[PDB]
Design a protein around this nucleic acid. Sequence first.
DNA 1: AGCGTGGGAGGGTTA
DNA 2: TAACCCTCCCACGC
Length: 117
Amino acid sequence: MRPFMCAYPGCNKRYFKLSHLQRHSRKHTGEKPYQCDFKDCERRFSRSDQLKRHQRRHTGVKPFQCKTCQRKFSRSDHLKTHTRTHTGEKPFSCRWPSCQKKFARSDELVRHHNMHQ
DNA sequence: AGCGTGGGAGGGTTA
DNA sequence: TAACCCTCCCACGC
Ligand SMILES: [Zn+2]
Ligand SMILES: [Zn+2]
Ligand SMILES: [Zn+2]
Ligand SMILES: [Zn+2]
């Protein structure tokens, strides 16, 4: 399954790719060489992709646009869940007894599940 | 309730 | 040999 296993004592985390393991290894070492050099910000990241995603907050760039209402979004995963507001898709159904409510996002189902109990 | 929108994280592809 | 792009998990706020 996962041939790349973390060698840190007690971690026991395994990965499919070596790049995934080397990316995880910075969690133990704590190195965050990708600092944000914008003013009034001290955010640091161990990954370059997380820094550039964060720096969209400073630049205001929204590269992902909804083809229905033309609204732009900073992140592609948030455009995907926004599209369900137009299509009405709710792929996450509550499995509580007698309940039939469905939700477009998983965190909405988790919040609804916590309301049952 | 429904949904915008961050960080943290793991999947993938690519010279 | 990591940068790059993707969605998910979890969280916070209105
Ligand atoms: Zn580890
Ligand atoms: Zn910043
Ligand atoms: Zn839209
Ligand atoms: Zn329910």
